[PDB]
């Protein structure tokens, strides 16, 4: 254990990187990109405010991190009080669940690329991946996953738009823009199937 | 103060907007419909010749009825700002 004043300095300094922790280490990027792509899908880039989407992504991130938060509480929050482990052995012990989660959500190709970017030859085991190699690989994997989910969301709305345009063309209309007609049908399909709750359920299942 | 007063506030405001925008929109619509029916009668179809007289008609619309719009909107704003301290809650 080192000095209390140094501990305060380090704690307040690490408090600054909270957006970095939320974005790079948790899943917040995935939900935020999925929400952005879904908003782009419905054809209305300002229908729900950016604030509301950010808060919804924050709540989803909190739930989906609740198991990792519980593991942190068991391994770090509690034993720091009983003083069986503290300072070093614990902060790292508490960060271990984050490492397990990010290993689970990271693809092998990104990790391989970032290892050969750091000349880390003897990285043989999969539970001793350094943070420098694990973090950007995890972010890239999250970007790929979010884009895939966005395309899957895109498919039904694209189908509806194409169907509306095809019926307009077949009915004889050649000048009517299909977007105006298809927008309320997109909304009634989204509400009627209750798209939002199934979307969040799938995102939670998507881990 | 009451929600009835508020919603009345919105209605009268947006009816003022409707009165302000109705002459220009209606003139443009009439010009477009007239040019379209003339095209149908003459069997002429270019999407650009309907855009020409519309601008001239709508711009003349400000010449003729512009002072009326300017006097109506100023009266609305003046009355709203004068009645502001009596609809406070």
């Amino acid at each position: 254990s080192w000095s209390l004043s140094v501990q305060t300095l380090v704690f307040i300094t690490s408090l600054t990187f909270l957006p970095a922790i939320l974005l790079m280490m948790t899943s917040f990027t995935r939900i935020i990109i999925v929400f952005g792509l879904l908003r782009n899908a419905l054809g209305t880039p300002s229908a729900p405010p950016n604030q509301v989407l950010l808060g919804l992504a924050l709540f989803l991130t909190f739930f989906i991190m609740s198991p990792v938060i519980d593991k942190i509480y068991v391994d770090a929050y509690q034993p720091f009080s009983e003083q069986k482990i503290s300072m070093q052995e614990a902060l790292d012990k508490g960060a271990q669940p984050l490492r397990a989660f990010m290993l689970r959500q990271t693809r092998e190709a990104d990790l391989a690329l970032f290892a050969r970017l750091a000349n880390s030859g003897p990285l043989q085991g999969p539970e001793a991946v350094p943070m420098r190699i694990l973090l950007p690989a995890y972010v890239t994997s999250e970007l790929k996953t979010a884009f895939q989910i966005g395309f899957t969301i895109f498919i039904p709305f694209l189908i509806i738009d194409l169907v509306i345009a095809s019926v307009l063309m077949a009915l004889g209309m050649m000048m009517v823009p299909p977007a105006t007609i298809a927008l309320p049908f997109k909304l009634m399909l989204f509400v009627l199937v209750d798209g939002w709750q199934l979307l969040m359920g799938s995102l939670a299942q998507s881990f | 103060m009451t929600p009835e007063s508020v919603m009345m506030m919105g209605t009268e405001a947006m009816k003022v907007a409707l009165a302000l925008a109705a002459p220009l929109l209606l003139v443009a619509l009439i010009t477009g419909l007239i040019i379209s029916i003339l095209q149908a009668a003459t069997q002429i179809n270019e999407m650009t010749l309907s855009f020409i007289p519309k601008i001239v008609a709508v711009f003349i619309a400000i010449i003729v009825a512009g002072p009326w719009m300017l006097n109506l909107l100023l009266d609305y704003v003046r009355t709203l700002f004068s009645n502001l301290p009596y609809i406070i809650g």
Binding site: W2, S3, S5, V6, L9, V10, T13, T16, F17, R132 | -
Partner: protein, 72 residues
């Protein structure tokens, strides 16, 4: 690497503070062989080191905030 160097610097500063505090504590009890001028000099050196650490932290935090505020 860089995190390792930062950790080493923080460890050195805290060792400074701990040594100064322990020397002052021993001198408070009346233990022999510890002089007042040495205690004061060590305390001032520890304060200087801690202020240097604080300033370095401030500059690094400001640089990080300035970098992260760019418009891609």
């Amino acid at each position: 690497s860089f995190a390792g160097q930062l950790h080493a610097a923080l460890d050195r500063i805290s060792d400074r503070q701990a040594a100064a505090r322990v020397q002052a504590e021993k001198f408070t009890l009346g233990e022999p062989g510890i002089a007042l001028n040495d205690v004061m000099a060590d305390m001032q050196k520890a304060s200087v080191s801690m202020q240097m650490g604080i300033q370095v932290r401030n500059k690094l935090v400001a640089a990080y905030q300035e970098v992260m505020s760019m418009q891609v």
